[PDB]
Amino acid sequence: LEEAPWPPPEGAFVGFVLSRKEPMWADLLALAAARGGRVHRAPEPYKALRDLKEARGLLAKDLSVLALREGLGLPPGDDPMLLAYLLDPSNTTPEGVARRYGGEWTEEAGERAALSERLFANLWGRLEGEERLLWLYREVERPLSAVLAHMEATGVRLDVAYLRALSLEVAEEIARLEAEVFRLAGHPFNLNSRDQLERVLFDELGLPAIGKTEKTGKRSTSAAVLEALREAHPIVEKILQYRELTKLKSTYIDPLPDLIHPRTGRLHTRFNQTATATGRLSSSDPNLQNIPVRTPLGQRIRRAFIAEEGWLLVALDYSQIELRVLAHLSGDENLIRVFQEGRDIHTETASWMFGVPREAVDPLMRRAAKTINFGVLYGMSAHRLSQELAIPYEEAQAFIERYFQSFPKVRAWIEKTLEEGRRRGYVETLFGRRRYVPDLEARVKSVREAAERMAFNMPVQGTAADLMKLAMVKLFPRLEEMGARMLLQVHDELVLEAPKERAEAVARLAKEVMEGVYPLAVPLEVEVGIGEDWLSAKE
DNA sequence: GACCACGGCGCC
DNA sequence: AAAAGGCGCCGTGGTC
Numbered sequence A: 001l002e003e004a005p006w007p008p009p010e011g012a013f014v015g016f017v018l019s020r021k022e023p024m025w026a027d028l029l030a031l032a033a034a035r036g037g038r039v040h041r042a043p044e045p046y047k048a049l050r051d052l053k054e055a056r057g058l059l060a061k062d063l064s065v066l067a068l069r070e071g072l073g074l075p076p077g078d079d080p081m082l083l084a085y086l087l088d089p090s091n092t093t094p095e096g097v098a099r100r101y102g103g104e105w106t107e108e109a110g111e112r113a114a115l116s117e118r119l120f121a122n123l124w125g126r127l128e129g130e131e132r133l134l135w136l137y138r139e140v141e142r143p144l145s146a147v148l149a150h151m152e153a154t155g156v157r158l159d160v161a162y163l164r165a166l167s168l169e170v171a172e173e174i175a176r177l178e179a180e181v182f183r184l185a186g187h188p189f190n191l192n193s194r195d196q197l198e199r200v201l202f203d204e205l206g207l208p209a210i211g212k213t214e215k216t217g218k219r220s221t222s223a224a225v226l227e228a229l230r231e232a233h234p235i236v237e238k239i240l241q242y243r244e245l246t247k248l249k250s251t252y253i254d255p256l257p258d259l260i261h262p263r264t265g266r267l268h269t270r271f272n273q274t275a276t277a278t279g280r281l282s283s284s285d286p287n288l289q290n291i292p293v294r295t296p297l298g299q300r301i302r303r304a305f306i307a308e309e310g311w312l313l314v315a316l317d318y319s320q321i322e323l324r325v326l327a328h329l330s331g332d333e334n335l336i337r338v339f340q341e342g343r344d345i346h347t348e349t350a351s352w353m354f355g356v357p358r359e360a361v362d363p364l365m366r367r368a369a370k371t372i373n374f375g376v377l378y379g380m381s382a383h384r385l386s387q388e389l390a391i392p393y394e395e396a397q398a399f400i401e402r403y404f405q406s407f408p409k410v411r412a413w414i415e416k417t418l419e420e421g422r423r424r425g426y427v428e429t430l431f432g433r434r435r436y437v438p439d440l441e442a443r444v445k446s447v448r449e450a451a452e453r454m455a456f457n458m459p460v461q462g463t464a465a466d467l468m469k470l471a472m473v474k475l476f477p478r479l480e481e482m483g484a485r486m487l488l489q490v491h492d493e494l495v496l497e498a499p500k501e502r503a504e505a506v507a508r509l510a511k512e513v514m515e516g517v518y519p520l521a522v523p524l525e526v527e528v529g530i531g532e533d534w535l536s537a538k539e
Numbered sequence B: 001g002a003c004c005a006c007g008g009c010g011c012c
Numbered sequence C: 001a002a003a004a005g006g007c008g009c010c011g012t013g014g015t016c
């Protein structure tokens, strides 16, 4: 390309190099642009950011987040990664996309700019005629990237002092647990090493090995296994408590306080837009889509996520959403009737599991019932179910047959989805998002059947993701109007932050936008709460 | 100091 | 662990 002086003309494709992958923490090492057979290299990257009206190119959102960090309004536009991801969601990295669609992902801004231009041309060619994929790109993915850039740049407030104090307490309790474990083993060892634990449990203490690990065939020490060995030795209970505390302390309590940004005073995640096989977002650096919530200590940790002074958090979560999506895709009459009578399948399974009245089903029970409901739906085995319910194999077998006979059309849809995936080589969500699943005709049963469970799951999980994405695109502009913020997405949940005076109006509005994002054969319901912390805002 | 593979486990 | 699906991060262990 002919070398031209900075700046580039309007509509040019950008290339840029970061000192590290996280845009909120990265130094912008270089910046360049490409258009009309020219490549313009910025003498000094930071100042050059001011000359752009739009971040157009590979990883556009990342550059936009860094721009927002610097107080510049530089929205992301076209991004060949989004085009490639729609064509085939196995396209998740610029390294692969470049190799596949006509170039090489290097570490030089100018070359990344030229590559962005060429890849866009070629990928735009591939999507011509693909009207439903083009719709997803224009009406969902491209606009969503701008929304995500703002969320990432905004961050969420965290009660650091609270977590620091919690650490010192959890440390003392962990010490009590390991001290006990060691006394029972008759000697100290690395309790964190599942290899050393394996030897202590099954060799020295001679406990029964229940299962094996996948890749290396070692005797498993997983929670599911320790659970079955709960009454076989007192040491086992200590180990399960040790595991819970150490998991929470090492993953959340300790790391998170160290990640507060100096400029913002807040915690910043990344929302990865081309990361999953189904169309879901993911979150990383840190992952804020897996903050604890189940156990008492987990709930303590979730309370650390708080609103800014003078603001409130608003949490909205779709009700039983993949089940409602299943109703629409399958067309089962019984399942539809469930959602039009306002029945709660998660609560019904809960009351049955714990053998209590429905008004007696508490939160901890209902969440347990959810893993059972989706477990069975997406192909759980009778044996695994009888194990997690501490009921006879015959009883688990019965629960699973009743489950599907209750909703006849479901099996039918599953079968027709697999049939169609074998012919075309892919399955699709309600909006035409595709996932390619080539193993549907594998000749090894276990491989084939694994492929099948992935295949018929994707339309359901992916449609739910489509709905949430579309809802975020619709909702974002309305929140800006009201001086409110979008903070996090957790698959079918949104956490917003609103001035206290507007919080109530924001909650009502967001609930309506989400519920009416795209009407189905059943109503979409959304639970919403308001509170000073993430836990309170759902309770 | 960086990789990666693995088992394991947090959430949806 | 076992015919749930989708993720990302932890510590260990091995390596460079």
Ligand SMILES: CC[C@]1(COP(=O)(O)OP(=O)(O)OP(=O)(O)O)O[C@@H](n2cc(C)c(=O)[nH]c2=O)C[C@@H]1O
Binding pocket: A317, A318, A319, A320, A321, A322, A323, A346, A370, A371, A374, A375, A464, A491, A492, B012
């Ligand atoms: C993105 C949709 C979804 C949301 O999770 P959710 O909000 O906790 O549950 P609901 O919306 O169904 O019900 P409600 O409490 O009313 O909101 O992730 C899925 N999910 C979840 C779990 C726990 C699991 O173990 N396996 C699983 O596949 C399927 C599910 O519908």
Ligand SMILES: [Mg+2]
Binding pocket: A317, A318, A319, A320, A321, A492
């Ligand atoms: Mg939900």
Ligand SMILES: [Mg+2]
Binding pocket: A317, A318, A490, A491, A492, A493, B012
């Ligand atoms: Mg949810």
